[PDB]
C-alpha cells in the first residue's frame, strides 16, 4: 500500500541548563511504486516514534509525477538549497542507480532506468525536497502537448 | 441541567460554567458537525488567513470575499465586496440561504 522505506538517523540536541537532550531527526519516504511519491518530516526523543510520526505527513504529501513507462520524461534540474542534482534520461537503460540516500527514495517511485549525480554539497536533507521538486515540474509529453503548439500530435510526430 | 453542584463544592461549579460558556460560544453549535466538512465560507481573509492556509492542504474548496487590502495567494473563490456593512453581508447571507434552501433536497 504505502510501501515504506526508511533511511535517516542522527542526533540533534537542545543544550538547556539541565543538559543536552538527544532528539532524533529521522527521515523516510512513502509511495506506491507507480506514480504517487511524497515524504514526511519526523523527529522525536527516540528512534521508533520518529519514523512513525513522519508517516502521517507522507500520507498527505504524495505528489503524482505521471510515471511514463515506469521512468522519467526528460532531463530536468533538481536544483535546491544545497544540492543541484540532474535527472538524466536513460530510456530503459535497465539500471537503477541514483545518489547516495536518493537511491532508497527512488525505489518507491518504481523506476528501473535513470541517471543522476548530486551536484554541490552532499546533504541528505536537500535531496528529498529536490528529488520530488525535480519530479514535480517534470511533465509527461501529453501535458506539454496540451499546452505548447495547440496540436498534440505534431510534437508527437 | 439537573445536577452538577451536589457532587463537589459550589465554588468549583462557577469555574465550570466559566469553562462551559466560554467553550459554548467559541465552539458554537458546531459540536454536531461531521468533524471535517466539505466546504468553509470565509467573510474576510485579513486575520482569518490561517483558515485559508489550512483549508487548502486537504483539498477542500473554500470561498472568499475580497476587499482592497487582502491577497488571493491561497484562496480559491475570490469574490469582491466590502467587508464593512451590517445588512449587506446578510444580503450575501440571504443569497446563499436561497442556495442552501436547495442544499437540503
Amino acid at each position: 500500500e504505502l510501501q515504506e522505506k526508511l533511511i535517516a538517523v542522527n542526533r540533534v540536541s537542545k543544550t538547556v541548563k539541565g543538559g543536552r537532550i538527544f532528539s532524533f531527526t529521522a527521515l523516510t519516504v512513502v509511495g506506491d511504486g507507480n506514480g504517487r511519491v511524497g515524504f514526511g518530516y519526523g523527529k522525536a526523543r527516540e528512534v521508533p516514534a520518529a519514523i512513525q510520526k513522519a508517516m502521517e505527513k507522507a500520507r498527505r504529501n504524495m505528489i503524482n509525477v505521471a510515471l511514463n513507462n515506469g521512468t522519467l520524461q526528460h532531463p530536468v534540474k533538481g536544483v535546491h538549497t544545497g544540492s543541484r542534482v540532474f535527472m538524466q534520461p536513460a530510456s530503459e537503460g535497465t539500471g537503477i542507480i541514483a545518489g547516495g540516500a536518493m537511491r532508497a527514495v527512488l525505489e518507491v517511485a518504481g523506476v528501473h532506468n535513470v541517471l543522476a549525480k548530486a551536484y554541490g554539497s552532499t546533504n541528505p536533507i536537500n535531496v528529498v525536497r529536490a528529488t520530488i521538486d525535480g519530479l514535480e515540474n517534470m511533465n509527461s509529453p501529453e501535458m506539454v502537448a496540451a499546452k505548447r503548439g495547440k496540436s498534440v500530435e505534431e510534437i508527437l510526430g | 441541567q439537573d445536577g452538577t453542584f451536589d457532587k463537589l463544592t459550589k465554588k468549583e461549579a462557577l469555574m465550570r460554567t466559566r469553562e462551559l460558556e466560554k467553550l459554548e460560544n467559541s465552539l458554537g453549535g458546531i459540536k454536531d458537525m461531521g468533524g471535517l466538512p466539505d466546504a468553509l465560507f470565509v467573510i474576510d481573509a485579513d486575520h482569518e488567513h490561517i483558515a485559508i492556509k489550512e483549508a487548502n492542504n486537504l483539498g477542500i474548496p473554500v470561498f472568499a470575499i475580497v476587499d482592497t487590502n487582502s491577497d488571493p495567494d491561497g484562496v480559491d473563490f475570490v469574490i469582491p465586496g466590502n467587508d464593512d456593512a451590517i445588512r449587506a453581508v446578510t444580503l450575501y447571507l440571504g443569497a446563499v440561504a436561497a442556495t442552501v434552501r436547495e442544499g437540503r433536497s
Binding site: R59, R60 | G34, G35, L36, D38, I60
Partner: protein, 124 residues
Amino acid sequence: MVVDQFREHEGEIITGVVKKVNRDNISLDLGNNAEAVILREDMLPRENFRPGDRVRGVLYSVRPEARGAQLFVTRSKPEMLIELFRIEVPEIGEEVIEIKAAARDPGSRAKIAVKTNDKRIDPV
C-alpha cells in the same frame, strides 16, 4: 432502565451466549435475565451454533410483547455489515467516513458505498 441505558446496544452489535438452538430460531442469553432471539432468516446460511457458543449480532428490533422474545437480533441484514465496519474502521465511528449504502447477499457477497468530506482521506 438497563435497556434504555444500552441505547447504543439496541442497534449496535450486541454479544450473547447461545442458550437454546431450535429449528426456526436461536435463543441468546445477554445476561441480567435478558433473552434475545435470532430467527432462521436472520442467520447466515452456513452458520452452526451450539449451546454455550458466543454470537454477535445487531439488535434490529425491540418489541414490548406480553409473551415471547422482546429482543430481535440479526446477522443476515445489511445493518450487521454497517456496524461491523463502524467498529473495525475508527474513521466511520468518528463520522469522518460515511457509509451511504449497503447491499448484501448474506454469507456470500456484499457491497458497501463509502463517502468522505475530507479530501486527505481515501475512504476505500
